């Protein structure tokens, strides 16, 4: 609870969540986001609570990811890391489509 | 340059629209570019 970090499979840096710079960490059973230099994740979603994901496509001034939950909930993650924005986006993206169904099993 | 310019931000909010739905893979592996298939049918010499 609070300060908890399970096996991180993907480490993405410089990720903005609603005008907040931080980092996105893909974990074995969940996805979490926390501002830079923070031990506590302000955003924590288990793949079992996510319905599908979306990505702000090429062409936008900023490449981002969107997590759509079962109730129509959405968590936006902006890859503010100029170095590997698109690259880290697709890394999180492909790994999500990979880990999402691992827990996602429902009719919604 | 850069810091000598009027480069400042405090309102660069995240786009909440224009996100292309990302489907699941389940049975997929990133792997690596394999083009060394010894099953072409010419491997007889």
């Amino acid at each position: 609870m609070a300060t908890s970090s399970e096996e991180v499979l993907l480490i993405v840096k410089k990720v903005r969540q609603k005008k907040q710079d931080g980092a996105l960490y893909l974990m074995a059973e969940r996805i979490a986001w926390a501002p830079e230099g923070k031990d506590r994740f302000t955003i924590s979603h288990m793949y079992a609570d996510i319905k599908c994901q979306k990505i702000s496509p090429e062409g936008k001034a900023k490449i981002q990811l969107q997590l759509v939950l079962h109730a129509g909930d959405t968590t936006n993650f902006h890859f503010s890391n100029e170095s590997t924005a698109v690259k880290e986006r697709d890394a999180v993206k492909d790994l999500l489509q990979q880990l999402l169904p691992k827990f996602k099993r429902k009719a919604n | 340059r850069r810091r000598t310019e009027a480069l400042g931000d405090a309102e660069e909010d995240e786009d909440d629209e224009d996100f292309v739905e990302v489907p699941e893979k389940e049975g997929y592996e990133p792997h690596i570019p394999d083009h060394l298939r010894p099953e072409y049918g010419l491997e007889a010499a």
Side-chain angles (χ1 to χ4, degrees), chain B residues 8-42:
Chain B
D9 161 50
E11 261 311 323
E12 215 288 285
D13 223 278
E14 275 47 80
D15 309 68
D16 293 313
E17 36 44 86
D18 190 31
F19 289 71
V20 287
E21 199 112 43
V22 197
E24 52 266 80
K25 342 269 281 212
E26 181 127 294
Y28 140 96
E29 211 267 278
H31 217 66
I32 224 136
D34 177 22
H35 33 104
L36 310 171
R37 293 284 101 238
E39 303 98 17
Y40 293 141
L42 300 173

Side-chain angles (χ1 to χ4, degrees), chain A residues 2 7 14 25 27 37 42 56 64 78 92-93 106:
Chain A
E7 295 92 308
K14 270 197 72 182
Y25 306 95
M27 332 197 92
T42 30
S56 90
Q64 301 152 90
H78 167 206
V92 173
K93 150 187 156 271
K106 265 158 282 177

Side-chain angles (χ1 to χ4, degrees), chain A residues 45-59:
Chain A
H45 289 289
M46 286 202 62
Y47 301 131
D49 329 309
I50 306 167
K51 185 209 307 293
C52 41
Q53 49 157 335
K54 312 227 228 288
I55 42 188
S56 90
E58 276 43 54

Side-chain angles (χ1 to χ4, degrees), chain A residues 2-71:
Chain A
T3 314
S4 309
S5 312
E6 299 87 83
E7 295 92 308
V8 192
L9 308 183
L10 200 71
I11 297 180
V12 175
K13 272 306 182 181
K14 270 197 72 182
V15 179
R16 274 188 174 195
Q17 209 290 93
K18 271 306 116 179
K19 270 229 283 304
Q20 289 153 87
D21 253 301
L24 190 79
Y25 306 95
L26 296 204
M27 332 197 92
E29 324 298 292
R30 69 170 161 119
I31 172 175
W33 178 91
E36 203 40 272
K38 298 301 150 293
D39 65 281
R40 267 143 292 153
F41 302 93
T42 30
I43 301 293
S44 190
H45 289 289
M46 286 202 62
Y47 301 131
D49 329 309
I50 306 167
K51 185 209 307 293
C52 41
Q53 49 157 335
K54 312 227 228 288
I55 42 188
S56 90
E58 276 43 54
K60 269 199 162 296
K62 22 201 283 179
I63 300 104
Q64 301 152 90
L65 189 91
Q66 183 169 85
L67 286 187
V68 176
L69 303 210
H70 298 303

